[PDB]
Amino acid sequence: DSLAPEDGSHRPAAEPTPPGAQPTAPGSLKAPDTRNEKLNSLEDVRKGSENYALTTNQGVRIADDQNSLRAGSRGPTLLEDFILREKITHFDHERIPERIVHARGSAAHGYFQPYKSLSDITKADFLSDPNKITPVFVRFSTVQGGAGSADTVRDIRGFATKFYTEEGIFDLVGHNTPIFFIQDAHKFPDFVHAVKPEPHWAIPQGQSAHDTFWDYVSLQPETLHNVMWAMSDRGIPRSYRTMEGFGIHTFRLINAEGKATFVRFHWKPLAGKASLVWDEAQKLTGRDPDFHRRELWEAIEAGDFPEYE
Amino acid sequence: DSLAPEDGSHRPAAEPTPPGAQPTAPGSLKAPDTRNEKLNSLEDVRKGSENYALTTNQGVRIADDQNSLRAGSRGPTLLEDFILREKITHFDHERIPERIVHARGSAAHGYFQPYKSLSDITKADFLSDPNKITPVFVRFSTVQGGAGSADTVRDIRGFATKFYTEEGIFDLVGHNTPIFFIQDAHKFPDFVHAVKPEPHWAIPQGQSAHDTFWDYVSLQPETLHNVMWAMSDRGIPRSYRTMEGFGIHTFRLINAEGKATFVRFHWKPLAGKASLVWDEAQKLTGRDPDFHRRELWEAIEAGDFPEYELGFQLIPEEDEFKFDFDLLDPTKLIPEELVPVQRVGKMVLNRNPDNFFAENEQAAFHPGHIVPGLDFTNDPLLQGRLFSYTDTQISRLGGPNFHEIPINRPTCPYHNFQRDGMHRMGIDTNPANYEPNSINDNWPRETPPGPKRGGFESYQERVEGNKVRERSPSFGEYYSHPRLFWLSQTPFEQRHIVDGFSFELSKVVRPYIRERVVDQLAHIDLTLAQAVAKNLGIELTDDQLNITPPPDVNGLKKDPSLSLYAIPDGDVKGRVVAILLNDEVRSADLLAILKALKAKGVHAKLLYSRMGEVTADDGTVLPIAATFAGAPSLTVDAVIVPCGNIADIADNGDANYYLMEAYKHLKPIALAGDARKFKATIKIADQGEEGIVEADSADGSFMDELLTLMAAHRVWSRIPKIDKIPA
Amino acid sequence: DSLAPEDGSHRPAAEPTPPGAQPTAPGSLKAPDTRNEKLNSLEDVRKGSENYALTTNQGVRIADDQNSLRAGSRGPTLLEDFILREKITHFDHERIPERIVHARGSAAHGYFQPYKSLSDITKADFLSDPNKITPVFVRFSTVQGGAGSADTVRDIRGFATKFYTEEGIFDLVGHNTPIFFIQDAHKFPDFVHAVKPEPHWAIPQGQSAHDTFWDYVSLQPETLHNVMWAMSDRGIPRSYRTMEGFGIHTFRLINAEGKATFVRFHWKPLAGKASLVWDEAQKLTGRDPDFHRRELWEAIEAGDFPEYELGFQLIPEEDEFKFDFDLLDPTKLIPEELVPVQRVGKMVLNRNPDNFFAENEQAAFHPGHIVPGLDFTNDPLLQGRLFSYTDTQISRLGGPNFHEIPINRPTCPYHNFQRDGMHRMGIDTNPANYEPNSINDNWPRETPPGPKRGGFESYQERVEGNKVRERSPSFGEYYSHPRLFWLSQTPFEQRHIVDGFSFELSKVVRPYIRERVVDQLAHIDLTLAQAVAKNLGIELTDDQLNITPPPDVNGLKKDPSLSLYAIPDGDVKGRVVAILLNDEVRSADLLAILKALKAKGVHAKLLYSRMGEVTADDGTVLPIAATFAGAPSLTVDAVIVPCGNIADIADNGDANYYLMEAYKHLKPIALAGDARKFKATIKIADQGEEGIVEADSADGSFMDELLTLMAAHRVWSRIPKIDKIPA
Amino acid sequence: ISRLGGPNFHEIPINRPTCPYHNFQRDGMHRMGIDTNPANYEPNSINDNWPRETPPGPKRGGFESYQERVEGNKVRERSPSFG
Numbered sequence A: 001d002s003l004a005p006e007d008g009s010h011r012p013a014a015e016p017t018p019p020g021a022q023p024t025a026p027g028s029l030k031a032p033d034t035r036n037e038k039l040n041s042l043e044d045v046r047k048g049s050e051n052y053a054l055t056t057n058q059g060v061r062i063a064d065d066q067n068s069l070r071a072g073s074r075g076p077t078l079l080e081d082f083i084l085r086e087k088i089t090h091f092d093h094e095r096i097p098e099r100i101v102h103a104r105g106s107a108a109h110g111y112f113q114p115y116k117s118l119s120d121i122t123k124a125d126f127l128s129d130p131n132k133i134t135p136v137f138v139r140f141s142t143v144q145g146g147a148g149s150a151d152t153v154r155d156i157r158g159f160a161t162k163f164y165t166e167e168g169i170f171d172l173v174g175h176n177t178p179i180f181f182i183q184d185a186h187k188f189p190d191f192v193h194a195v196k197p198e199p200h201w202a203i204p205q206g207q208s209a210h211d212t213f214w215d216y217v218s219l220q221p222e223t224l225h226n227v228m229w230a231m232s233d234r235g236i237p238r239s240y241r242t243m244e245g246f247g248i249h250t251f252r253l254i255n256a257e258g259k260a261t262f263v264r265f266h267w268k269p270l271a272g273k274a275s276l277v278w279d280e281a282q283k284l285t286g287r288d289p290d291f292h293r294r295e296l297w298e299a300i301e302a303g304d305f306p307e308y309e
Numbered sequence B, C: 001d002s003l004a005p006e007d008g009s010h011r012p013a014a015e016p017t018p019p020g021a022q023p024t025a026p027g028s029l030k031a032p033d034t035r036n037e038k039l040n041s042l043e044d045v046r047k048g049s050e051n052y053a054l055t056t057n058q059g060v061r062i063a064d065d066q067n068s069l070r071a072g073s074r075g076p077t078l079l080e081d082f083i084l085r086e087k088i089t090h091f092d093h094e095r096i097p098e099r100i101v102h103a104r105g106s107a108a109h110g111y112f113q114p115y116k117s118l119s120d121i122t123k124a125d126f127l128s129d130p131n132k133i134t135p136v137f138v139r140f141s142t143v144q145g146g147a148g149s150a151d152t153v154r155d156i157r158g159f160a161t162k163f164y165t166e167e168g169i170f171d172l173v174g175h176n177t178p179i180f181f182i183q184d185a186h187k188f189p190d191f192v193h194a195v196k197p198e199p200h201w202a203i204p205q206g207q208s209a210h211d212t213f214w215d216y217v218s219l220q221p222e223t224l225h226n227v228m229w230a231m232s233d234r235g236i237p238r239s240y241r242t243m244e245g246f247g248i249h250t251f252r253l254i255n256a257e258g259k260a261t262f263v264r265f266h267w268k269p270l271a272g273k274a275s276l277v278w279d280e281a282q283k284l285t286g287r288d289p290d291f292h293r294r295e296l297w298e299a300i301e302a303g304d305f306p307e308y309e310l311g312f313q314l315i316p317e318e319d320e321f322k323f324d325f326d327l328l329d330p331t332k333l334i335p336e337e338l339v340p341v342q343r344v345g346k347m348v349l350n351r352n353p354d355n356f357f358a359e360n361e362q363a364a365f366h367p368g369h370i371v372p373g374l375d376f377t378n379d380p381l382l383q384g385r386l387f388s389y390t391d392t393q394i395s396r397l398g399g400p401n402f403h404e405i406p407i408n409r410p411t412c413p414y415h416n417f418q419r420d421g422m423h424r425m426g427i428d429t430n431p432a433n434y435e436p437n438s439i440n441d442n443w444p445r446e447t448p449p450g451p452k453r454g455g456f457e458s459y460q461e462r463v464e465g466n467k468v469r470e471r472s473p474s475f476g477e478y479y480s481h482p483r484l485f486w487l488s489q490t491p492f493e494q495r496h497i498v499d500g501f502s503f504e505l506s507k508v509v510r511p512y513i514r515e516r517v518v519d520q521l522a523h524i525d526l527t528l529a530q531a532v533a534k535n536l537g538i539e540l541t542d543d544q545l546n547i548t549p550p551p552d553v554n555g556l557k558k559d560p561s562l563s564l565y566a567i568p569d570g571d572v573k574g575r576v577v578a579i580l581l582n583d584e585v586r587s588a589d590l591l592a593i594l595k596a597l598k599a600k601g602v603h604a605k606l607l608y609s610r611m612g613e614v615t616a617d618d619g620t621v622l623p624i625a626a627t628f629a630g631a632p633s634l635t636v637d638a639v640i641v642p643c644g645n646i647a648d649i650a651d652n653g654d655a656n657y658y659l660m661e662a663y664k665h666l667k668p669i670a671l672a673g674d675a676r677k678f679k680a681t682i683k684i685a686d687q688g689e690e691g692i693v694e695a696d697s698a699d700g701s702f703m704d705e706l707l708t709l710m711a712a713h714r715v716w717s718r719i720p721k722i723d724k725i726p727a
Numbered sequence D: 001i002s003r004l005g006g007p008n009f010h011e012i013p014i015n016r017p018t019c020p021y022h023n024f025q026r027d028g029m030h031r032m033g034i035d036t037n038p039a040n041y042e043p044n045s046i047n048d049n050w051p052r053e054t055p056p057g058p059k060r061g062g063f064e065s066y067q068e069r070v071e072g073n074k075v076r077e078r079s080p081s082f083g
C-alpha cells in the first residue's frame, strides 16, 4: 500500500543539481560524501528509516497505525491505548520557545581555513596554521520577526558562526552592518520592545514602519547611524551570499608574549554585494516568504557554495 | 522627561473613530465604559503607569535607566549591578512556546444572549433564560503557520469561544468549514506533519502547496471533502466577520428529564459571507501580513461590532441511522436542506484586549470543557481531542495551574482538593486536602445531578462490542459529500476551485503525485478533473473517463447553503472605500461622496502621491491618510475617483496601477467627470460596462449605483475580461 | 453527609493553646485577628471551603468523586472522563525542584520595629522612625539535606528575613555563625559538592561525616574557622528561637549626606542561647525528624513568639585597615570585644502560614535585594552571591515573574517596562513598553537619588587595579580566628568540640584524611590536636609538637561573646517538662507542680504507659498526652516524677529508660516521696547530687530548685559521671 | 513530561531501549536523535512508506489488544463484586 512509483522518481539524485530540477532533501542523503569532523561526530545520533519496523519509543512494533482502540467499531476510545497516548503526547509537546531576537533564520555546515600563520599577533590555535581546517556551523537571520515571518523584509541581518576548534568552541556572532543602534546593553530591552510589534495588538510583523520605533529613534540620536544603513538597500539583500558581515565590537588579539592588539572582524562575500529594490522585496514577502531560505538550500544543492573571506 | 506634544495629539479620543483616523490603543483606554462581568473581574490584575515612579520588580526606584554600572565611565561592567541583571533577565525569558496548531490568532471580548428558553431540550444554565447574559472571549486563527506568519493565506480558520457561565466554563472550539480532513484522532500528527513545513528545510510557511500535503491527500481519500472546502474561496475569507462558524462533531444536549438529543453547532455571520480572490490574498500577505488582525481590531474601535447568530441542527435519537452517512463521521456534513439550522441566540464582540501576550497568547481553549446540559458522543476525532488539550497546556503554559492565569479563570466559584504545582496562586485554608474527610466535615461536597445547579453526570449510553483497533464500515464512503459540494457552487466559484487546485498542484515537484490527485478528482466529478488536468498538461485515461459518479446524498443533488454567493447576504456597513485625490478636487463631488458613505456606514481612505494636506477647489483642506503605494487597492472594497485637476495624477504610474489591480480583483470603480479619462487605462469601451460607475459629476444615482454593486461584493460578470490585462 | 463528630472536637479553639492540647491548624483559622499589612494583602488569594460545592478547576460541579467513568461497572476506563484526567493531571505535576542548598526549612510571619531613628547613619526608610512597623516573613533552615531530611542534624543553620518596606523589598539572608567556610564565590560549587551526598551512591544524608567533606577541609585551611563552629554545640541548636543570627559580610550604610559607614548585621535571641548534646540530637533525627519545624509552629500557637533584636557592628570608613584581619574576608569575625553590637530594633514572629507549599516552598530570598540607604562591598563571596539568587529562581519557580507569586509580592507599588514571561499575571495598560517614550509622556519615570523616596544610586567607590584572578594577600591567614574561638569556650564546650571532631573523623574511611585534618588542628592548638588524635589512635610526631601557635587577634586572647554558655541568658518561658504518671497520682503533688509551672510559662506533658486516662487519688481525671516511648525524654527539657502508686511503674523498662536517657543528656530530674526509689536506676549517691531534685513531697522549695536548674539549661557538673551509665 | 523535562525522556541513556526504535515522531525539548527520513508522516510514498507497520504474529509481530468482550452503559459506579 501507498508505495513509491515504479520509476524511482520519488527520490532525488545524490549529485549536484540545479534549482527546481529535483526535490530537495536532507543533506546526508543529498551529499553523502561531503564530510568534515563535526559532520562525522554527528553519526552517533543520526537515525535512518528504510527497512525498519514502525515502533513506539519503547521499541514495541505497531500493528495498526490508522486507528484508536475502542469498545466496538463505533464505540468510545479506551484509556488503555498507550500507543495512541504516546503518539499524541509527543505531538502535544513538539514546540520550544523561539529566540527572543533573531527567531527567523537559516543555517548550513561548512569549514574555515587560514591563509597564513597568524602567531605573531594571536596564539589562537585555529589561526596558527594554513593547513589546519576548522569545521563551522553558520546561521543567517532577520532580527524582528517571529520564526514563521518572511525572509525579504526591511531589517538588519544576523550572521552567526560557530568554529569547532581544537582548544574550544569560538562563536563569532555578528550582523551585516558595522555598527549597532545603541551604545549600552542596559538599553537593549527598550530598543527591542520599540521595534517589535506593539503590545496592545501585536502589529506589525517584521517591520520597523510603525509609531513606537520612530518615537524611540527621534528621542535617541545615537541610533541614527544604523537607521541610515537600514533605510538604504543594505536592509534588503538579494541573498545571504551577497551581503557583508561584521563583528561590530572592537575585540582583542593576544600573542604568545602577552602583547595585545585591537581588532574589528569582517566577512567579505566572494559572490559580491547585491540587494533587491523595496517594491520587489515587499511583494516577495507575499509571493514567497521563504525566498532567502530556499535560495541558500538550493545554492548548496547546486554546488554554488557560499564563500566568504 | 515630559516628552508628549503640548496639544496632546499623542493619544486617541476615547470614543468610536474610523479606521486609520487615530492611533489604536489598549481596550480599557479606548472604550472605558464597555463592561461585562469578565472584564470587571480582570480589574484586580490591571496595572496603570501614569504618575508612577520607574522601579525594579521588587519596588526599588531607579535613578538612571540609561546606563550600566561600570568602574570608570569607560570601564568594565560590574557584576553587582542588580538593576541591569533583573532588566535583561526578564527580557531574556519573555517567550513561551507557541500553540502546536493555530499558533497565529486574533482575539476579542464580548457577550452572548439566548433568544428564548431552551429548557425543553437542554438544562445548560446559560441557555435557560433570555435575560441571562454570558460574557465571552473569542480567538480567530489560521492552522498551519507560526505565530508570526501572515493572516490572508489559504487555509482553514479556527473559531474558538470561551463562555464564562454560571455553572462553569464552556469552550466551543470550532472551524470555518463543517467537516474536518480525517476520521480518527490517531492520524492527527500524521495529517499535521504533512501540511506543516517539510522537516529537512522548514519550507513552506502558511501553505498547503508542497509535496507532502498532496502525497498524504492522494493516499487518503477521507481528506477529499475538506480539501474541496480549502481550495474554494472559503479558504481566503475577506475578514473574520464574514465567514461561517462550525463545531463539526455531533454532540448531545441533555434535558432535565434526562432525554438526549443529537446536535451540530453553527455560527452565522450577520455581516454575511465574503471572501477575497487568490491573487489578491497572496499579494496581501506581503503588503500587509496583519490584515485580518488589523481589520478585526479597527472594526471594534469604530463600532462595527462583529455579530454572529448561534444555531443548532437537531436530530432525535431515534433518527441516528436514517441518513446515507454516519452522524459520528466528521468528514461528512448534515445538509441544511435535510435538517434546518435553528437560530438560538447571538454573540456580539465589542472590546479589544489590553495586552495581547497576557490575554490572547495565554488563553487556553479545550473541547472537553463542557457543562451539565451537554455531553459527548463516540465520534473518534472528538474522542482523541479530549486527551490532547489538557496535555499540551502543561508545557505551553508551564504547569497545571493554567486556570489561575487571569483570562482563563471562571467567574463562578471553584473549590476542590487539588493542591500545589508550579506557579501556585491560590492559598488554600482548608485543613483537609482529601475526601472523604471528617476534619472539615467533608467540605467541599459532591452535589447530585438535578435540573439546575446539579453535579455532572454522563449520559448512560449503551456500549457493546469487543476491544478493537478498527474503522467502522459506515465511515467508508469518500466521494459523495465532495460531489454535493461541487454541484452547489455557482459557476464562477467552480472556476476558483479549479484554479486553487491547479495553482497548488503546480508547486508539487514530483509529477506522479499530481497525477494520482487528478485520478482521485475523477471519482468526484469528471468536469472538475478534465479542467484541472488541462492546466497541468495531463490527459485522462479512457478508464478514468468512464468512472461512475458517486450517489446523491439522501436524494439531494444540490444545497444552496453550501455556496458563498448563490443566495446573496451582503451588508455594506463596515466596508471601506478608496478615494484617490488630486491637488484641486471638486469639493461638490467630495461632499456628495462622503455624505452618502456615512449614511451607509462605509469608511473612506483619502489617498494621494505624498503625505500631508491637499487644498480643495473651494479652499477646503484635506488631510491625506496614506499614499497610493502605502495603501494598495488590495486593502479597500471599491475605488472612487473624483473630478478636479485630473492631470495631476493622469500620468502617475501608481494611480493607474491602482485602477488596474482593483479592476483585476473584481472591485467596483467609480469615475466622476474627467476622471473618466482613466477608462483608457483599463480598456473600457466608450459604451461602458457593468461594474464601472461613470457620470458627469458625483451626485445622485452615482453613489446609489456604486453602493448597489458594493452590496453584491464583487463584479462576477467581469471574469471573462480579466485574462488579458497585465496586472 | 456530616462525617464530623457531634461534640465538634475535630476543630481547634481559635485562642492561644499549649503544645499538644489541640490539633494544629492553618494560621488564619487558628489566629484570625493577628494581622499585619502583608497578611491582609494576601486576602485576595486565600481560599475558603465550608459550604461550597466540590468542582473541577473550570467551575463544574462533581456528582461522584469516588469512581472513574467505565463501560459497564466491571469495564474499561473511558478516555472521555475529563473529570478524572484533570484530577490525575494536577496530582502528576505537583512537585517543583527543591532549593539547591538550604532545601529543608520552616517559616513564619511577623513584624519588625526599630528602637529609634537611624537617619544619622542610613537613609533606609524602614529604619527611620520607631513607630514605622515593617511586615516580615522569615525562613529558618539547614544547609546540606533535601526537603525531606531531618531537622536536628549537625550542620550550619540559615536565617533569612524578607522585609516588606515602603521603598521596596529588602532581604537579609544570613546564617547562625559569624563567618562562612570559604573566601571566593568561585569555590562554592566545589565546597557544596564536597559536603553533599557523594555522587556514586548518594550517601550520606544531612551529614558532613564522610571522606569528601574532610578531604576538602584538609586541603583548604580557609575553611577551618567555620569548621570549629560546626563541630561545636553551635551545630545542633535546641530551637530556631535559641540560636544567634548573622549576615556575615560587611555591607555599607549610606546616609542622606552621602556618607558611607561599614556594618555587619546581627540577630540576638531574646530567649537565650541553648543547644542539645550530640547523642540526643542524633537520636532525635529518628524519634522526631520534624522536631524544630514542630516546636516553632507550636511555640507560635502557644503565644511563645520567637523574638530577636537586630544589631549593628559599626566601623567608620577611615578605620578599614585598623584590624590585623581584612574587613572583606568572610572567614574572619569582628570580636564584640573590639567592636560592640548596637541593639537597634526588634523582630517578632507571631503567625504561622496557611499553606506550607504556597508560602514556605515558593518563597524566594536574595541578598542582592537591598534598598536605598544600603550598599555592597568587594567581599569576593558576596560579590558572586549577587549573580546566583536570581538565576536559580528562573528554574526553581518557573520563569522571570516569581515576584508575582503572592508571598513574594512587594506591598509597595512596582511599575516598569518589562513584559511577558511564563505565567504573567499583571495586565499592563500602558501604551508604551520602552523608554524614553513620548506616547505615554515617558511614564513611568526615573527618580533622582535623595534623602527619602529617591532613586537608587551606588556609593562611588574608587576602583584601582588590573583585571586579575588572584586572592588578596591580606586574606592569607587561617589559624588565629579558630584559635581565639577555641580559647573562648568553657571547658565542657571544649570537650564537646573534641568529641565532634572525633566522632566525624572516625567515619572517614581513608585513614590518611584523618591524619591530615589532625595536622591542621596542631596549627590552631596543641591541646585540641592531641585530644582528637588520642581518640583516633594517632600519635603526634616531633615536628607537630613544636609548631608555633598563631598570634592573638588585635591583642585579644579570648571573647566570652563566642561561647554559648560562658555568660548565662537562658530563659525558661516556652520550655517543656515531662511528668511521669502512675495509676494513682497524689493530687497534692500534681497541683503544686502545675501551678508553679504555669507561673513561669513552662508547658507540661503527661505521660503514661498507655493512652486514655488515669484517675488521681482524689478522683480527678487526668488525660494522657502521650506514652513513655511515644514522647521520649529527647523531646523535653526536664523530667518530674510525682508520688502515688510508684509500684505501678517501678518495674517498667521504659519508665526507667526515660530517666537514664534524660540523666545521660544532662537534664534536670525531680522525684518526690517514693519516686526517690528511682535513684537506684541511675545510681545516685546517698547524701544527694546536684541536678537531682528530691523531697518528701512536691513543695515550693522543690519547684524553685527545679525551675532554677532549668534556667541554667543543662547540669554541666554531671559530665564526669555519665561515662559509666549505659543508655 | 514535567519531572524529566519533555517528551524525549526515552533518549535519556538509562531509559533507552537496546533494540531499534523508529517512528514518525519529531522535535520536542532536548531532541537527541537526528532523523534523516524525508517523510515525517504515514502513509507516505516519498520514503516508500518506511518505517512500516508489522502485522501480529507468533514472534516479532506488531502489538494487538486481546479482543475482550465489553458490555454495559457509561457509568461512574463501583462493582457490587468489590464490596
Ligand code: HEM
Pocket (backbone or CB within 6 Å): A099, A100, A101, A102, A105, A139, A140, A141, A158, A159, A160, A173, A174, A175, A180, A185, A188, A247, A248, A249, B088, B092
Ligand atoms: C552588536 C550587537 C549585537 C549583535 C551583532 C547581535 C547578534 C545576534 C545574533 C546574530 C543572534 C542570533 C544567533 C542565532 O543565530 O542563534 C543574536 C541573538 C540574541 N541576542 Fe544578540 N546581538 C547584539 C546585541 C545584543 C544585546 C545587547 C543583547 C542583550 C543585552 C543581545 C541578546 C541576544 C539574545 C538573548 C539572543 C538569543 C540567543 C539564543 O536564543 O540563543 N544581543 N544576537
Ligand code: HEM
Pocket (backbone or CB within 6 Å): A088, A092, B099, B100, B101, B102, B105, B139, B140, B141, B157, B158, B159, B160, B173, B174, B175, B180, B185, B188, B247, B248, B249, B330, B363, B364, B365, B381, B384, B385, B388, B389, B392, B393, B396
Ligand atoms: C474537529 C476537528 C478540530 C477542530 C475544529 C479544531 C479546532 C481547533 C482550534 C480553533 C484551535 C485553536 C484554539 C485557540 O484559539 O487557542 C485548536 C487547537 C489545538 N488543537 Fe484542535 N481542532 C480539531 C482537531 C484536533 C485534534 C484531533 C487534535 C489532537 C488529537 C487537536 C489538537 C489541538 C491542540 C493540541 C491544539 C492547541 C491547544 C492549545 O495549545 O491550547 N485538534 N484546535
Ligand code: HEM
Pocket (backbone or CB within 6 Å): C098, C099, C100, C101, C102, C105, C139, C140, C141, C158, C159, C160, C173, C174, C175, C180, C185, C188, C247, C248, C249, C330, C363, C364, C365, C381, C384, C385, C388, C389, C392, C393, C396
Ligand atoms: C555568606 C555565605 C552565605 C550565606 C549566609 C547563605 C545563605 C543562604 C540562605 C539562608 C539560603 C536559603 C534562603 C531560603 O530559606 O530560601 C540560601 C540559599 C541559596 N544560596 Fe546562599 N548563602 C551563602 C553563600 C552562597 C553562595 C556563595 C552562593 C553561590 C555563589 C549561594 C547560592 C545560594 C542559592 C543558589 C540558594 C538557593 C536560593 C533559592 O533557591 O531560592 N549561597 N543561602
